[PDB]
């Protein structure tokens, strides 16, 4: 169980950040849409 | 008081991660600025 | 020992925030071209 709880939480923030880097790659692939339309 | 302290310290790093993920989203929402200034 | 623990979390998390900024510098490719 609480310490091994936290080391859970941090790995499941690291979910959220690999989330952000989803979002950024799926901007990159809109940007490369834009550069299509140009 | 000590471990309910430690469990304080970790939750207030998890403050900073949620600071960082502010910063990443408010860069993402600058990127969508760049993609505006087309 | 424990401030060990947090600094070696910030290893992992701020490791990943490396990966996000070095995706951001991929995003700045098109936003370079346009």
Which residues in A lie closer than 8 A to residue C12 (C-beta atoms)? 10-11, 14
Residue B1 lies in a domain: no
**Closest residue to B35, CB basis, from A16, A19, A34:** A34
Residue B37 lies in a domain: yes
Which residues in B lie closer than 8 A to residue A30 (C-beta atoms)? 35
Instruction: Test A32 with C31 for CB contact under 8 angstroms.
Output: no
Report the structure determination method. Answer: X-ray
Resolution stated for this PDB structure, in Å: 2.1
| Rounded CA separation C16/B2 (Å) | 30
C-alpha pair distances (Å), C28 with each of A2, A29, B31, C13: 41, 12, 9, 22
Q: Which helix (H) or strand (E) holds C2?
A: helix C2-33
Q: CA C7, C8, C13, C19: dihedral to nearest 10 degrees?
A: 120
Q: Name the residue range of residue B30's domain.
A: 13-38
Q: Which helix (H) or strand (E) holds B31?
A: helix B2-36
C-alpha pair distances (Å), B30 with each of A3, A24, B19, B20, C22: 37, 12, 17, 15, 16
Residue B4 lies in a domain: no
The distance between the two most distant Cα atoms of chain B, rounded to a whole number of Å, is 56
Phi, psi torsion values for C4, nearest 5 degrees: -15, -80
Residue from B17, B23, B38 to probe the interface with C (highest C Cβ count within 10 Å)? B17
Q: Is residue A32 within 8 Å of residue C30, measured between CB atoms?
A: yes
Number of domains in chain B: 1
């Amino acid at each position: 169980x609480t310490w091994e709880x936290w080391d859970x939480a941090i790995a499941e923030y690291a979910x959220r950040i690999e989330x952000l880097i989803x979002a950024a790659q799926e901007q990159q692939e809109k940007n490369e849409x834009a550069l299509x339309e140009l």
